[PDB]
Write a protein that binds this DNA or RNA. Structure first.
Ligand SMILES: [Cl-]
Ligand SMILES: [Mn+2]
Ligand SMILES: [Mn+2]
Ligand SMILES: [Mn+2]
Ligand code: NA
Ligand code: NA
Length: 314
DNA sequence: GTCGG
DNA sequence: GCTGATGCGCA
DNA sequence: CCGACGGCGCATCAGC
């Protein structure tokens, strides 16, 4: 991490803009800077050097000069010094507590995990769960364990129906050594009329075998919940998302959820060059959805040699 | 906050 | 009771 | 100087 000091400062600034200031555009601006600096192959010696980078402007360059010179930033020092900011920032670490709920709680005098634990009544189902598994949800997931989770998900899916396709995407599919969570895409030849229970079947099964232990949200296309490898020292509970998408939106969905949100941004960047527009559902000339029967295909559009998953962090 | 308009 | 309004998390 | 900057599935609940 050639410039981790700087990207950490920028990311703590972004979090503050999102969580306290509720300025989502600044939050994004700061994350854009952090990413262009994290991808930069030199050790930055000055703000003027960073300023060459797109996403890095006047203000950020100046903060960079201060950090490189002092090793700190007075603004972040001040922020972290304030009770309200620091408390609002912290509470958003609970899944289900956003900037609005965090700010409501703090104003009520509820500012800590203890306070939360001492006010179950003012928490909704999702927030109770994020609290219950606060530490767990902050832990990384070793690849060895992801491979084991993947096993259970593919197998139980098969047991419901021999046609379902399940693919684990996100950091996992990129070959990453650890994951923040598990992201599962699901398709089935019958869904491209409609039918209920298509996702519900898979969810119910995984519950039956005690893999999925908690539900955060659930509808006919998206499941958000908690899961755990069977057991010795219990394994930590983990976040899992499952998405049911139309079989004809498969590769666009897989490509998009594979991860490297960065990679996404710039494959989007080069999309509108040969005049294309790609989202998670389709690639369009906008026009009607161009035929997609591979990840290479989507590339074929904007020229562009096929990147394999484990290469697309960039 | 940054960048194109 | 209802539902329009809003919050939340997520590549 | 100034406006654009991603959208959506699902859950909750203030104000009828
Ligand atoms: Cl903003
Ligand atoms: Mn207290
Ligand atoms: Mn993930
Ligand atoms: Mn995810
Ligand atoms: Na710049
Ligand atoms: Na949160």
């Amino acid at each position: 991490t050639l410039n981790g000091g700087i990207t950490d400062m920028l990311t703590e600034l972004a979090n503050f803009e999102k969580n306290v200031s509720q300025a989502i555009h600044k939050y994004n601006a700061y994350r854009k800077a952090a990413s262009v600096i994290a991808k930069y192959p030199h050790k930055i010696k000055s703000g003027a050097e960073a300023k060459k980078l797109p996403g890095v402007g006047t203000k950020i360059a100046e903060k960079i000069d201060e950090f490189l010179a002092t090793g700190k930033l007075r603004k972040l020092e001040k922020i972290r010094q304030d009770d309200t900011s620091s408390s609002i920032n912290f509470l958003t670490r609970v899944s289900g507590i956003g900037p609005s709920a965090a700010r409501k709680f703090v104003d009520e005098g509820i500012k800590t995990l203890e306070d939360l634990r001492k006010n179950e009544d003012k928490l909704n189902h999702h927030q109770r769960i994020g609290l219950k598994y606060f530490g767990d949800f902050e832990k990384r997931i070793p690849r060895e364990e992801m491979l084991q989770m993947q096993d259970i998900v593919l197998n139980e899916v098969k047991k419901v129906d021999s046609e379902y396709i399940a693919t684990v995407c996100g950091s996992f599919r990129r070959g990453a050594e650890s994951s923040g969570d598990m992201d599962v895409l699901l398709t089935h030849p019958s869904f491209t009329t409609k039918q209920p229970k298509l996702l519900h079947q898979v969810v119910e099964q995984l519950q039956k075998v005690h893999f999925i232990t908690d539900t955060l949200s659930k509808g006919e296309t998206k499941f958000m919940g908690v899961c755990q490898l069977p057991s010795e020292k219990e394994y930590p509970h983990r976040r899992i998302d499952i998405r049911l998408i139309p079989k004809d939106q498969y590769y666009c969905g897989v490509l998009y959820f594979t991860g490297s949100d960065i990679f996404n941004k710039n494959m989007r960047a080069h999309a509108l060059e040969k005049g294309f527009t790609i989202n998670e559902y389709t690639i369009r000339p906008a026009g009607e959805p161009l035929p997609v029967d591979s990840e290479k295909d989507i590339f074929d559009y904007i020229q562009w040699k096929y990147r394999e998953p484990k290469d697309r962090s960039e």
